[PDB]
């Protein structure tokens, strides 16, 4: 059985503080507690006595109602917390009943709060826990009677999302200590981070007890990831961020990733004790607690002589000042000195951060009992018969519906989840002096609100730290092409030409006929290449086409104007007229082998493709057959089959039909496939005028040309040896050679090449212009 510091008042608010240390394993089942805690224990038993002194002197809160207490000792352990909880209800359950405890200022572990909450929920005793900060204690199916003036670790989850988001960090690897604290907190953060548009690489479940090799190997998987990621969110504790840091030493990785942990190491300087220089640029956070000052004065006025309402003050002294008070009772005969008259608590005093919360909680109860009284004993002042015994379930009703203002001018506040607002301090560890390190603010969090006062944060070191799993290439031509891994870890790629980002992830190749607009934001009409003049280097083909027409217009001037020329009209006149027809049909179309392909103009164009060439050779075959028919028909080619007629107009009607045959073959091979182009674009770049040409319709007319030339030059093998004139027929076998060579040497530079149109123009214009130049331009001078 333990000690119990109590005030006899009217309504009694029980208390469980962490007076001692938890029993060490020696005596856990014996459940005897260690030494006093002095900063969690008796500091708080005095804060509570102080605050009941205030509330019993305050004329607003409970006038004509004394507010007693029964303080017990939880010891920061579940079994002792529960023995004590059972003692509170012991008297209430039945030299008689003294007073049912109205509420319990809830013991300061999460996991002895839970374990006491079970026992108190049985009895209708609302329990207000100033530092039970676990997630699971918002679920009021189980822990229905569980108020608290601290936020759940869901609000640290929110705050650390606020920091990593408020720096546009998105690829933060996650670590945590294992347990109800570290796993619950980190899991809530993790899912919140997922939906918000954050990411991770690993989720390390390191223990608070793990070996140096364990932190080493978790840090090693972190380290393999480190070329990408530079930020490590942590729900790690004191010794765990310590052990992770110890692995960082053993690797020589003192200042590399911006670790960003919860309040497991906000004002834990122990996590960096003799170690500081290796945790530079870590953005930790805590609870915003002010200090509380009238409590400081109450504490530092505590006369060990004048107190008669607090056991464990004596032990607070005898453990703080190591002196056995020889005359005083409960002397610690195990400490070696005697107490002088002049010691006082002014030395080494640290008012705890959880103290503002203890006094807020003792208020939230006193205002619960008040608000209940104002709404359930109306017209009467202090205890009425209703609220005697004071009900617990209805008290929980008012106690959760009672807003308030605290000690530090802040408002205590309860949701439907019986949890608090969550006011935070967002801190950093940085160069504060000559190489010196102390935990300092940048600013704060508040309910939903952030305050990064950025200027003080890490002097541009945390102002330059950045990590994302893929650096946004949200410009067109540059898709995001990933594996099926995770939403942050993609890869950027550049698009193909035909494509463009309509769908941002996937460049849409639009149809042929629309080519992708600059920046790959769409696609518009493609330019075209019809070829009228076609260039200045094609104005050269035009120069020779033009110039050939000038001289052949001059031949039609002075040749036919003469009318009488003995060499021209030596043989049949009809043969002479057929040659004239032949040559200028060979040279009417190459003056306009420039043409535009259109559906209407397709008869005009696709005609001049093969029928320019057809008539170009119809010229050459008229002259070839003139010389070969005069070889055959005269005694020059001697033969038994010399098919002549009686009236030489028949010997020239054969010629008319021997030209109409090639005419028919070419118009036939046209009207087998009616006129069109087929706009083959060999690429999304190259756009040119490319009409259909079945290579059949090249090799057939070509071959017909070459075969009629070679049969006539075969007959005219005997004029390549001797002319019987002014050298006509010899120069015409020279014409046959010089023209057939350029035709049958032109075939691979039209066939095996790329460009076709002007090359056919070259072939056929050259062939006719040189046929003229070699058979018809000499004669005009020889018969002057």
């Amino acid at each position: 059985q333990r000690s119990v510091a109590r005030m006899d008042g009217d309504v009694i608010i029980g208390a469980l503080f962490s007076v001692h240390h938890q029993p060490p394993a020696e005596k856990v089942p014996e459940r005897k507690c260690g030494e006093i805690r002095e900063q969690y224990g008796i500091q708080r038993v005095e804060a509570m006595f102080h605050t009941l002194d205030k509330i019993n002197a305050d004329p607003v809160l409970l006038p004509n109602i004394t507010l007693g207490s029964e303080i017990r000792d939880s010891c920061w352990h579940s079994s002792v917390a529960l023995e004590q909880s059972i003692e509170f209800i012991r008297d209430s359950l039945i030299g008689r009943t003294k007073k049912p405890i109205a509420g319990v200022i809830g013991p300061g572990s999460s996991s002895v709060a839970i374990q006491v909450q079970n026992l108190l929920q049985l009895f209708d005793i609302p329990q207000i826990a100033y530092s039970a900060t676990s997630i699971d204690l918002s679920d009021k199916t189980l822990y229905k009677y569980f108020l608290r003036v601290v936020p759940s670790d869901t609000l640290q989850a929110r705050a650390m999302l606020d920091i990593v988001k408020r720096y546009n960090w998105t690829y933060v690897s996650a670590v945590h200590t294992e347990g109800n604290y570290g796993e619950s907190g980190m899991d809530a953060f993790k899912e919140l981070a997922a939906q918000e548009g954050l990411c991770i690489a690993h989720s390390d479940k390191i223990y608070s007890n793990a070996g140096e090799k364990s932190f080493d190997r978790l840090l090693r998987k972190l380290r393999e990831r480190l070329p990408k990621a530079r930020v490590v969110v942590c729900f790690c504790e004191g010794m765990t961020v310590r052990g992770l840091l110890s692995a960082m030493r053993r690797l020589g990785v003192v200042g590399e990733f911006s670790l960003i942990g919860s309040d497991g190491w906000a004002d834990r300087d122990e996590v960096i004790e003799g170690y500081e220089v290796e945790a530079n640029g870590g953005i930790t956070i805590k609870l915003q607690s002010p200090e509380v000052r009238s409590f400081d004065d109450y504490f530092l006025k505590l006369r060990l002589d004048t107190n008669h309402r607090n056991p464990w003050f004596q032990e607070f002294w005898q453990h703080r000042f190591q002196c056995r008070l020889e005359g005083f009772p409960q002397e610690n005969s195990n400490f070696k000195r005697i107490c002088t008259g002049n010691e006082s608590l002014e030395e080494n005093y640290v008012q705890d951060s959880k103290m503002g919360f203890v006094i807020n909680a003792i208020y939230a109860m006193a205002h619960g009992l008040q608000n209940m009284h104002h709404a359930l004993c109306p017209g009467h002042v202090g205890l009425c018969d209703a609220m005697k015994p004071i009900d617990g379930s209805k008290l929980l009703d008012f106690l959760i519906k009672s807003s308030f203002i605290g000690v530090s001018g802040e408002e205590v506040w309860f949701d439907e989840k019986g949890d608090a607002p969550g006011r935070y301090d967002i801190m950093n560890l940085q160069y504060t002096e000559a190489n010196r390190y102390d935990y300092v603010h940048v600013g704060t969090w508040h309910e939903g609100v952030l305050n990064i006062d950025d200027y003080k944060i890490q002097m541009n070191k945390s102002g330059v730290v950045r990590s994302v799993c893929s650096e946004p290439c949200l410009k067109g031509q540059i898709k995001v092409i990933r594996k099926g891994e995770v939403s942050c870890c993609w890869i950027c790629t550049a698009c193909k030409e035909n494509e463009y980002v309509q769908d941002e992830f996937t460049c849409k190749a639009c149809d042929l006929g629309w080519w992708p607009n600059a920046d790959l934001t769409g696609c518009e009409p493609i330019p075209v290449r019809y070829l009228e003049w076609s260039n200045i280097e094609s104005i050269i083909a035009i120069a020779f086409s033009c110039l050939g027409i000038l001289v052949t217009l001059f031949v039609t001037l002075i040749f036919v104007l003469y009318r009488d020329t003995p060499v021209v009209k030596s043989s049949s006149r009809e043969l002479c007229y057929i040659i004239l027809a032949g040559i200028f049909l060979g040279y009417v179309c190459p003056f306009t082998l420039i043409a535009k392909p259109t559906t209407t103009s397709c008869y005009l164009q696709r005609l001049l493709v093969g029928l320019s060439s057809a008539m170009c050779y119809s010229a050459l075959v008229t002259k070839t057959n003139r010389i070969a028919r005069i070889l055959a028909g005269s005694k020059k080619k001697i033969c038994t089959r010399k098919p002549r007629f009686m009236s030489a107009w028949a010997q020239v009607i054969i010629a008319s039909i021997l030209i109409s045959v090639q005419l028919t073959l070419v118009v036939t091979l046209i009207i087998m496939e009616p006129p069109m182009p087929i706009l083959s674009y060999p690429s999304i770049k190259e756009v040119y005028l490319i009409c259909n040409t079945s290579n059949l319709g090249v090799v057939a007319p070509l071959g017909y040309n070459g075969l009629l030339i070679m049969s006539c030059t075969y007959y005219a093998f005997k004029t390549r040896n001797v002319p019987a004139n002014f050298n006509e027929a010899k120069y015409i076998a020279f014409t046959m050679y010089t023209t057939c060579i350029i035709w049958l040497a032109f075939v691979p530079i039209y066939f095996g090449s790329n460009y076709k149109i002007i090359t056919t123009c070259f072939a056929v214009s050259l062939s006719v212009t040189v046929a003229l130049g070699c058979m018809f331009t000499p004669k005009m001078y020889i018969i002057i």
Partner: nanobody
Amino acid sequence: QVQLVESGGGLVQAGGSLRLSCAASGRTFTSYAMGWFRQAPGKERESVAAISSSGGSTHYADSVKGRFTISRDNSKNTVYLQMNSLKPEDTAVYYCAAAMYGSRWPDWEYDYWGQGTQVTVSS
């Protein structure tokens, strides 16, 4: 709260060493410190015997220091004394009183009292 009981007083001689067994109720008892006040008829109350909570160091009135011993059991919820070298006048009502807080001995604010025994003493 504490409820006491005092035994061991009785008719002994001048030189007769006698027990004083102050048994108790309450379970907190090892938190308290015991003392035995001495008030025989015709002479008012003076604190003569005392003992801290833990056992630890303890206290006897100098007048009888070395003429007694004090013992305690946190175990059995009960304190003990012994008189040595008894005298006719060493008798008194032995108010085993019990103080949790206090000052320097013997001014402890003795909270919970026992009946105590006017130990009948002869030679």
